[PDB]
């Protein structure tokens, strides 16, 4: 895929001034809705900027994503699309139904009969994407291996005689279901998922996919899937999404060439925002905000800049990264704290969110309240 004069093509639409919306809408075109999840996956695809000040502070440039949601919401579809669209992308499942496991080992390969070091799946995706379905059904050793990979960005093997440490700088995109098969907003995120706090603490974006009964959305999704079934019958075999091949060409060029530097970030705004969030979160019995959240916001701002190839993070990039990080952090909170932080930080969470979207959301909330009152 080493072409030339396609740098012109990528730059030609790079200046479109709305390419962000195009790319965010050009992820998994077979999945309706879930726009925020698509945005998060785009940011994960383009990635951040790994930096190790001196040689003693290793900071990962990846953006790990965890999609926790009740079943029947196309999480595995997102993971499979990422598998399809991203080079050096591998897919594995918490169950043993995956070709390659998460943990390293050494053995004679069954077909080649040769003694080889089967590196864990995470290692195979050394510079790519590792998709982990059924993230909440892993083994103890699988959990330990994912923890090691996410924490230290490497794997240490001492199985037979191989005392080695080989690095796995992967971006983990995971899919999981809530405990009991249904996500209950009355409980915080960290407690309605079969995952310990340290594991969840290493994910930069948490997407809480909820299947709530809604006649309009239900009808729209039914039309979508039934039309897909019609169009893929054997006999018959607000922007425009980019073609997938051009999308991956753009991803390659951005991920390989442009390395945005945050010399224009407004430290004042970020510091005040962080202090306010700390005070608010501790004012309530809620999971607090920590430094790693600022780290994740920095990574997402760099990734968003990379999407636009700016080479210099701009105020709007920082604001969008803050929007995404605050959306995730708020949705991880319980029901009451959800509204508390929504109202307290509605300004931040409304960046680049036009009036029509908020008005439609509020009207839908009101009509749903009316429906519930009617049918009780």
């Amino acid at each position: 895929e080493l072409t030339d004069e396609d740098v012109k093509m990528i730059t030609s639409l790079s200046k479109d001034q709305q390419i962000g919306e195009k790319i965010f809408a050009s992820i998994a075109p077979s999945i309706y809705g879930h726009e925020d999840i698509k945005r998060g996956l785009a940011l994960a695809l383009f990635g951040g900027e790994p930096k190790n000040p001196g040689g003693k502070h290793k900071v990962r440039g990846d953006i790990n994503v965890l999609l926790c949601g009740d079943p029947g919401t196309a999480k595995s579809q997102f993971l499979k699309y990422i598998e399809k669209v991203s080079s050096r992308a591998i897919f594995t499942t918490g169950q043993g139904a995956s070709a390659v496991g998460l943990t390293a080992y050494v053995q004679r390969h069954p077909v080649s009969r040769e003694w080889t070091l089967e590196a864990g799946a995470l290692v195979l995706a050394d510079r790519g994407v590792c998709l982990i379905d059924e993230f909440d059904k892993m083994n103890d050793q699988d959990r330990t291996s994912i923890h090691e990979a996410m924490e230290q960005q490497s794997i240490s093997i001492s199985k037979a005689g191989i005392v080695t440490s080989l690095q796995a700088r992967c971006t983990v995109i995971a899919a999981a279901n809530p405990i009991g098969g249904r996500y209950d907003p009355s409980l915080t995120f960290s407690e309605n998922v079969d995952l310990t706090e340290p594991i969840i603490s290493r994910f930069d974006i948490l997407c809480v996919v909820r299947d709530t009964v809604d006649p309009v959305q239900d009808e729209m999704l039914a039309r979508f899937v039934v039309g897909s079934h019609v169009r893929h019958h054997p006999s018959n075999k607000g922007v425009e999404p980019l073609p997938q091949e051009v999308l991956k060409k753009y991803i390659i060029y951005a991920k390989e060439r442009v390395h945005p530097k945050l010399n224009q970030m407004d430290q004042d705004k970020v510091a005040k925002m962080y202090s306010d969030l700390r005070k608010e979160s501790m004012a309530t019995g809620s999971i607090p905000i920590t430094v790693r959240h600022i780290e994740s916001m920095i990574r997402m701002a760099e990734a968003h800049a990379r999407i636009h190839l700016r080479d210099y993070v701009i105020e709007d990039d920082v604001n969008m990264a803050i929007r995404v990080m605050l959306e995730s952090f708020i949705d991880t909170q319980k029901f009451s704290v959800m509204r508390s932080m929504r109202k307290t930080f509605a300004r931040y969470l409304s960046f680049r969110r036009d009036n029509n979207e908020l008005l439609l959301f509020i009207l839908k909330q009101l009509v749903a309240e009316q429906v519930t009152y009617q049918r009780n």
């Binding site: 943990t103 005392v163 080695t164 310990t196 920590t290």
Partner: protein
């Protein structure tokens, strides 16, 4: 003629300069040291006589033999006068290396057979050193004559005995045949170079006299050798398994000037301060924690009393805190900075257990020791993150190891005591997740016995501050923007190693007196507080804590290479232990 080529190699060895003749002096020193081998830089050979290097690259098999013979003759010419009993000249293995970038294993097609090839890889298995015969003697069974000095080819190339002096009357005399070292290794392609959806390829390496055991499985290696096939008495037809004849190995990843540098670094009046601020510069705050970690890095002194009992000199540190503080980052730095160090989680690591295990190979019936983080980290540091989530077996194993420094394992085969002299640096979060004072002393589920093991326990909190939050966020943003008194990682690590190997201090009488009085007062205060609370604080103070304070004083005095720990360092160690007694006492 081949004699001309050997003469040219002799000239290159004798007269290559750089003034000084590198190879002549290298031969002198190696033969005097008994090494009887040399490392020939390929580029020097090419520059001096490019034809020789080209020949080597095209026909290594015999040109390397010519070079070895020339090196042997030159070594004789430079070190011929020897005492009786060793005057016999010794053959010389000639390892060769070059700066040429290695060629991917996938490019080792058929054409490159018998050429000199440089490839990268990861060695996943190494066989034991064995005997291969370079010179054999065969004696006839009937006439009992001998055919001594039958030249044997190197590499995996056997030899067929003569048929005619009966027919095939010859047998080998083991007592008269000269052999050398021998080893076979398995080299796998580096996982980075393996294509995305693709199996890793393999190759078989064959070492020689001094190349045996220069690597161990797991090393990332660059091999320069002769692509060769087995030669053993000659649906796949005419396929001869291929292997590499190893000639040069490079394993990828203290001078007196540096010793004097360390000496002057220790002599600085504020050496402690510069070391304290030179461990986690990126991490903001926690000066006391950084001082304690420096003390742990330098460690105390191991003492073996005349009765044989051993007092561990390695400090054990624990850090309980909210999941926000940069403590896993601190552990990562510590493992990256300690001379010998390993990072691991409570439940071991990824396919790398925490504590050692012993299993007997049912086929070979050996005693395979699968080394955990503890035994691998002998003489160094083990950084255990999520130290509160161990497994019962591992909990007991560390219970024994942290105090005795030894892991005792007795399996159906044998009993043994592996030596694990590791300093444990543990990180953990509260039982509930966030430290709440309302349940003070109930935020730790550790049994009292384990908490006795740790020399110091630090408690971190984020319960409230605005100025600190602003400063922290701005500092992190500044670090990501940028991306003096700071001893770089390599220099600091080498200084730590030099101090640990060289200086082992001891307490002075006055220091012992002061520490005695202070410890007595601490014990009295802890007992009184426990009585007042009418409950036992799950953070005891014992004579083990006295040992901990003594060890911290020893580490502080070892930083300065001072043989004796003074009163000031004992006071500083008492302050450091006070910053944990703040959790022993003020917590309740």
């Amino acid at each position: 003629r081949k004699s001309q080529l050997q003469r040219r190699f002799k000239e290159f060895l004798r007269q290559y300069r750089v003034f000084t003749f590198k190879y002549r002096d290298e031969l002198k020193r190696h033969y005097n040291l008994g090494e009887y081998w040399i490392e020939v830089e390929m580029e020097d050979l090419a520059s001096f006589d490019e034809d020789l290097a080209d020949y080597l690259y095209k026909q290594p098999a015999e040109h390397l033999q010519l070079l070895e013979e020339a090196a042997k003759e030159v070594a004789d010419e430079v070190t011929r006068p020897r005492p009786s009993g060793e005057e016999v000249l010794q053959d010389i293995q000639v390892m060769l290396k070059s700066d040429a970038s290695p060629s991917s294993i996938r490019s080792l097609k058929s054409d490159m057979m018998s050429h000199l090839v440089k490839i990268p890889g990861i060695i996943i298995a190494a066989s034991a050193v064995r005997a291969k015969a370079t010179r054999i003697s065969i004696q006839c069974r009937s006439c009992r004559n001998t055919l001594t000095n039958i030249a044997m080819r190197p590499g995996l190339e056997g030899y067929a005995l003569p048929r005619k002096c009966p027919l095939d009357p010859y047998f080998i005399m083991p007592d008269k045949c000269k052999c050398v070292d021998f080893q076979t290794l398995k080299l796998q392609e580096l996982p980075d170079a393996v294509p995305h959806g693709e199996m890793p390829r393999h190759m078989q390496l064959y070492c020689d006299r001094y190349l045996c055991d220069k690597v161990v499985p797991g090393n990332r290696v660059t091999i320069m050798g002769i692509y060769s096939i087995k030669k053993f008495g000659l649906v796949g037809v005419g396929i001869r398994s291929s292997y590499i004849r190893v000639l040069g190995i490079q394993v990828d990843t203290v001078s007196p000037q540096e010793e004097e540098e360390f000496r002057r670094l220790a002599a600085l009046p504020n050496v402690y301060e510069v070391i304290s601020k030179s461990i986690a510069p990126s991490i903001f705050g926690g000066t006391d924690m950084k001082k304690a970690i420096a003390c742990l890095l330098f460690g105390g002194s191991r003492k073996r009393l005349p009765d044989g009992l051993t007092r561990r000199g390695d400090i054990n540190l624990l850090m309980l805190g909210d999941p926000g503080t940069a403590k896993s980052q601190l552990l990562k730095f510590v493992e990256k900075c300690s001379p010998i160090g390993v990072y691991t989680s409570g439940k071991g690591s990824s396919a790398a257990g925490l504590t050692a295990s012993v299993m007997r190979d049912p086929s070979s019936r050996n005693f395979i020791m699968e080394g955990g983080a503890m035994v691998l980290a002998d003489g160094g540091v083990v950084c255990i993150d999520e130290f509160d989530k161990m497994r019962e077996d591992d909990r007991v194993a560390i219970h024994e190891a942290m105090e005795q420094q030894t892991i005792s394992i007795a399996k159906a085969g044998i009993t043994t005591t592996l030596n694990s002299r590791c300093s444990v640096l543990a990180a953990a979060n509260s039982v509930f997740g966030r430290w709440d004072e309302t349940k003070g002393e109930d935020n730790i589920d550790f049994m009292p016995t384990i908490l006795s093991r740790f020399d110091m326990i630090f408690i971190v909190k984020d319960e409230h501050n605005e100025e600190r939050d602003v400063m922290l966020a701005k500092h992190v943003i500044t670090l990501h923007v940028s991306a003096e008194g700071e001893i770089d990682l390599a220099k600091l690590k080498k200084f730590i190693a030099y101090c640990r190997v060289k200086c082992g201090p001891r307490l002075s009488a006055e220091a012992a007196e002061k520490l005695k009085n202070r410890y007595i007062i601490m014990r009295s205060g802890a007992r009184q507080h426990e009585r007042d609370s009418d409950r036992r604080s799950s953070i005891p103070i014992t004579v083990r804590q006295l040992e901990a304070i003594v060890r911290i004083a020893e580490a502080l005095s070892k930083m300065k290479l001072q043989p004796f720990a003074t009163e000031a360092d004992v006071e500083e160690a008492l302050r450091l232990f006070q910053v944990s007694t703040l959790d022993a006492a003020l917590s309740g």
